[PDB]
RNA sequence: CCACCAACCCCACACACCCCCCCACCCCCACCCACCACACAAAACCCCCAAAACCCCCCCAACCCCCAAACCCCACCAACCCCACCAACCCCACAAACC
């Protein structure tokens, strides 16, 4: 249900079939024959918006991420919930090691006013980024998070020029990232290009 | 592969004349959360038992050379334009003609 979007579909079939496949060989059992989920989903394709089913999804995540299990494999369904609606954060941090710097050093680099505020909000004291296993990886899955400080469209000036610069380095994961449009993407790709030009 | 007289735009009722228009409108934008058609972990050469590695090898050998006599896919003779009936030739001509 998460995964669903437009030009996704084949897509969906293989991660269902992958899906069937673990779920259908030892440690667990046939009990479903073949294609099942994906008619399943077609009838719950909205199922992912239900607070207590993705409560329960990021309920599992957490305890086979902290515990290998036999039947740890059920992870394959719930890792989506791990940071779950942190893409800027996530973007961060990625963006510092692909470009070799400490997060201070980069932030240096961020010539513009418009990132005052977002480098603000995603660097608040208090929660528990540093921690290996809490409560924060799975926040908004479960209950106290709201709306994610952390998204992508939260923290957008921030994105959108680490994305740039990864297109500038040719990374994939940036050329297929959606741009966050309000958040002045032309002079953010100025900036970035700039970025890229030196790390390149 | 000119020609019926005559007229000689495959022009022309009037009104007209964007294959414009009801209004509000006017991204084939927008629920939220999102936003790599990323992701269980472990891990990632579609690497690997060893022993090995010319899709090399019996030997004799090694022109898909050889009976011999031979060797133009030459030769009876007469010949030798895949010339030739003569008359002779524009696949010219009734006359009147000849976009």
Same mark, same amino acid.
Request: proline share 3%.
């Given at each position: 249900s998460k995964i669903s979007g437009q030009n996704t579909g084949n897509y969906k079939?293989?991660?269902?079939?992958?899906?069937?496949?673990?779920? /259908?060989?030892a440690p667990f059992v046939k009990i479903v024959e073949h294609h099942t989920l994906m008619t399943t989903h077609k009838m719950c394709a909205?199922?992912?918006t239900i607070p207590n089913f993705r409560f329960l999804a990021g309920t599992y995540?957490?305890?086979? +991420?902290?515990? /290998?299990?036999?039947?740890?494999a059920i992870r394959v369904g719930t890792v989506v919930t791990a940071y779950e609606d942190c893409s800027g954060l996530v973007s961060f941090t990625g963006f510092i090691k692909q470009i070799n710097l400490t997060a201070r050093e980069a932030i240096l680099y961020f010539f513009h006013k418009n990132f005052e505020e977002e480098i603000r909000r995603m660097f608040e004291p208090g929660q528990e980024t540093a921690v290996p296993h809490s409560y924060f990886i799975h926040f908004r899955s479960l209950?106290? +998070?709201?709306? +994610?400080?952390?998204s992508s469209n939260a923290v957008g000036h921030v994105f959108n020029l680490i994305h740039f610069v990864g297109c500038y380095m040719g990374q994939v994961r940036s050329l297929n990232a959606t741009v966050i449009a309000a958040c002045a993407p032309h002079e953010m790709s100025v900036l970035g290009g700039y970025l890229g030009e030196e790390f390149f």
């Open positions: 079939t293989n991660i269902a079939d992958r899906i069937e496949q673990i779920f /259908e060989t909205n199922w992912s995540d957490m305890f086979f +991420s902290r515990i /290998e299990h036999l039947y740890s209950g106290l +998070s709201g709306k +994610s400080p952390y």
